[PDB]
Amino acid sequence: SGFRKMAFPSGKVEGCMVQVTCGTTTLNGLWLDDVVYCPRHVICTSEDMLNPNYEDLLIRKSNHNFLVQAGNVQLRVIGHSMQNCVLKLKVDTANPKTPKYKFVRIQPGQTFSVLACYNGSPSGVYQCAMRPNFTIKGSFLNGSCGSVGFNIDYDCVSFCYMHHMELPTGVHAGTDLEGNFYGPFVDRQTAQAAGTDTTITVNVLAWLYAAVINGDRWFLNRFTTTLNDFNLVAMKYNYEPLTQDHVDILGPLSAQTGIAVLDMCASLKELLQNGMNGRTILGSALLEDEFTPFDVVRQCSGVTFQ
Amino acid sequence: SGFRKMAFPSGKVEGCMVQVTCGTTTLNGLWLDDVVYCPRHVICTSEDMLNPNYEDLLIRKSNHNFLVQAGNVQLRVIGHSMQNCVLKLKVDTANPKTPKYKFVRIQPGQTFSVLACYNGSPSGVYQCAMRPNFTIKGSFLNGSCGSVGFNIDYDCVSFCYMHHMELPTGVHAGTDLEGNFYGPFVDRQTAQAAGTDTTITVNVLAWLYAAVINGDRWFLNRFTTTLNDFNLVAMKYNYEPLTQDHVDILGPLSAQTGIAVLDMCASLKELLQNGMNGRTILGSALLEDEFTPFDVVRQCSGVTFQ
Numbered sequence: 001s002g003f004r005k006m007a008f009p010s011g012k013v014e015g016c017m018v019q020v021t022c023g024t025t026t027l028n029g030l031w032l033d034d035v036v037y038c039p040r041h042v043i044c045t046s047e048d049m050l051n052p053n054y055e056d057l058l059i060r061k062s063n064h065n066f067l068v069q070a071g072n073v074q075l076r077v078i079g080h081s082m083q084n085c086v087l088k089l090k091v092d093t094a095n096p097k098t099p100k101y102k103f104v105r106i107q108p109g110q111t112f113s114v115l116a117c118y119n120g121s122p123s124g125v126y127q128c129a130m131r132p133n134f135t136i137k138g139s140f141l142n143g144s145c146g147s148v149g150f151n152i153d154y155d156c157v158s159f160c161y162m163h164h165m166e167l168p169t170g171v172h173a174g175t176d177l178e179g180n181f182y183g184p185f186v187d188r189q190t191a192q193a194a195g196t197d198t199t200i201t202v203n204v205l206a207w208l209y210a211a212v213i214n215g216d217r218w219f220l221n222r223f224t225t226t227l228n229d230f231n232l233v234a235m236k237y238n239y240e241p242l243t244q245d246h247v248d249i250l251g252p253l254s255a256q257t258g259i260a261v262l263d264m265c266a267s268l269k270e271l272l273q274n275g276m277n278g279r280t281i282l283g284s285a286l287l288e289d290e291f292t293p294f295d296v297v298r299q300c301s302g303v304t305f306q
Numbered sequence: 307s308g309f310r311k312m313a314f315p316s317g318k319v320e321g322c323m324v325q326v327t328c329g330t331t332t333l334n335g336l337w338l339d340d341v342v343y344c345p346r347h348v349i350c351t352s353e354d355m356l357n358p359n360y361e362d363l364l365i366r367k368s369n370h371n372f373l374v375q376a377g378n379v380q381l382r383v384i385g386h387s388m389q390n391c392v393l394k395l396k397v398d399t400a401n402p403k404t405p406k407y408k409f410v411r412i413q414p415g416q417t418f419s420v421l422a423c424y425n426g427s428p429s430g431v432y433q434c435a436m437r438p439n440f441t442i443k444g445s446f447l448n449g450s451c452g453s454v455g456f457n458i459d460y461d462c463v464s465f466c467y468m469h470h471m472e473l474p475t476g477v478h479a480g481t482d483l484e485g486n487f488y489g490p491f492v493d494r495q496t497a498q499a500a501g502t503d504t505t506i507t508v509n510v511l512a513w514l515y516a517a518v519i520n521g522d523r524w525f526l527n528r529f530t531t532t533l534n535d536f537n538l539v540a541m542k543y544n545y546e547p548l549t550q551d552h553v554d555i556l557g558p559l560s561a562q563t564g565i566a567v568l569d570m571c572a573s574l575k576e577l578l579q580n581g582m583n584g585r586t587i588l589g590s591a592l593l594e595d596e597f598t599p600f601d602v603v604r605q606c607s608g609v610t611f612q
């Protein structure tokens with residue numbers, strides 16, 4: 001037993017991380033087959049990024065302007081093109097460590113693992129949830145541009161995030177591997193800011209089920225409530241409305257614990273209304289919303305990857 | 307910025323994980339050069355482990371009794387020996403993916419990354435602290451025997467933990483890679499239990515410095531206190547005494563923030579005495595003690611590994 005925020009093993013992604021240098025700018029790139037993917041911001045200069053014209057900036061580039069380093073081996077760039085906010089550098093060498101992979105965009109409320117990287121060298125790995133306002137609460141220092149987020153599903157790496165920048169509140173914004181931002185952000189210097197967030201209700205319920213599975217039961221009660229009566233309490237406390245689809249997603253956990261979804265909603269209602277009165281749940285004094293139903297089933301049942 | 311519980315990238319360890327099978331028992335092993343290290347409990351049977359005699363159990367074994375599987379390749383065992391609670395299976399093939407490594411024992415209060423594994427297949431990676439009572443608050447399901455804990459330091463993997471078992475309170479116990487238990491536990495079925503824990507005071511102070519670096523300042527104050535006057539408050543709340551050596555360890559963080567160690571002790575004193583009054587620190591409503599000064603400097607400055 002035990003419940004921990006757990007990232008996927010990062011080896012398959014570590015073997016794809018490279019360093020991309022253009023001019024005086026260095027960031028991380030992702031080397032899969034004979035293409036290196038990185039943020040197009042690598043072609044920007046000190047003045048450029050306020051209203052940079054990336055089309056103009058790219059046409060002024062040559063393949064030799066791009067220095068791509070995979071460990072202590074330099075990769076030769078033979079083509080360059082841009083897809084939205086990502087740059088694609090075609091190289092003369094296919095990555096022999098290319099895992100089976102997909103480019104998938106995730107939904108708000110979903111989780112992924114981040115491999116923090118600097119100068120193409122991986123630094124640490126941690127789990128993030130995509131917030132409802134399309135930011136993530138990460139840990140990124142200067143040089144982390146291009147670090148990727150991913151999930152692993154059997155042996156296939158589904159890449160879903162490439163890091164770009166930090167917003168004024170300290171949260172982080174980036175794109176999918178097609179170069180399309182998550183959220184209303186741009187790869188320009190503006191006073192852009194996150195905008196209002198909400199709590200991911202179904203994940204909180206999933207986490208309460210995780211807690212029951214792990215022996216934390218003090219918050220349970222005999223009461224129930226209706227899905228409509230819960231959702232009226234959810235709005236006062238800035239929780240997302242609950243759907244029958246989310247009730248359906250919680251079915252397996254509800255059956256394994258024998259606690260009806262609607263009963264756990266009653267417990268969440270009292271927790272929101274009364275607080276926790278000095279007690280903790282899975283070592284937390286706060287209701288945690290960064291674990292999906294899948295994450296809970298994964299860790300409270302235990303599948304491994306190859 | 308941002309502060310996250312962050313594990314080391316796990317690739318170098320993933321490439322060492324194998325499956326060891328003896329009889330009807332299967333667990334994880336660690337393949338380095340031509341040796342596979344695993345818990346000696348793999349040679350135990352249903353009846354054996356109450357007062358098993360491992361010396362007797364091992365002499366009754368042959369090399370062919372040990373099935374070692376590295377992915378979809380079977381390794382041939384050519385020698386076996388026991389070192390304390392670990393089994394060493396010499397195999398005819400040196401692991402071509404062997405990283406530079408060390409076997410190091412850690413201290414209570416120190417952190418490491420755990421690569422959770424099942425049937426030789428890595429599942430997830432997360433950070434753990436060695437508690438003062440020599441347990442860890444992990445996430446392990448059946449089949450996780452032999453999963454290893456480690457730190458990485460430049461390119462060298464320092465292995466410090468091999469997982470054995472779960473105690474009645476849901477916490478976890480294991481050994482170092484020499485097979486010596488952390489704490490007063492044995493690899494026998496007994497009613498052994500964890501015994502009293504305490505909070506790692508220097509880590510809490512490190513985390514408060516992390517919070518200040520990341521813009522959380524509401525808990526700061528003008529007051530100071532003496533090291534002796536702090537330690538008297540620390541005992542009431544079951545915190546470890548503070549040492550000048552811990553003050554010395556906190557020197558760099560104190561200088562970077564300009565907050566004297568003794569002033570942050572004053573802040574911790576008020577937090578313990580008053581609680582947090584509905585506010586949070588680095589997203590937590592509890593004082594967190596599972597980050598070392600090194601962990602904070604790592605993430606609030608940003609070194610990468612190769």
Ligand SMILES: *c1nonc1-c1n[nH]c(-c2nonc2[N+](=O)[O-])n1
Binds near residue numbers: 041164187188190
């Ligand atoms: C790194 N990788 O992709 N984009 C980046 C990046 N670094 N800085 C920015 C940026 N975009 O808009 N404002 C900023 N900034 O303030 O650094 N993007």
Ligand SMILES: *c1nonc1-c1n[nH]c(-c2nonc2[N+](=O)[O-])n1
Binds near residue numbers: 346450451
């Ligand atoms: C797995 N790897 O190393 N040791 C193990 C293990 N599995 N079960 C035990 C054990 N030792 O004492 N009691 C138990 N038990 O209750 O399972 N060790």
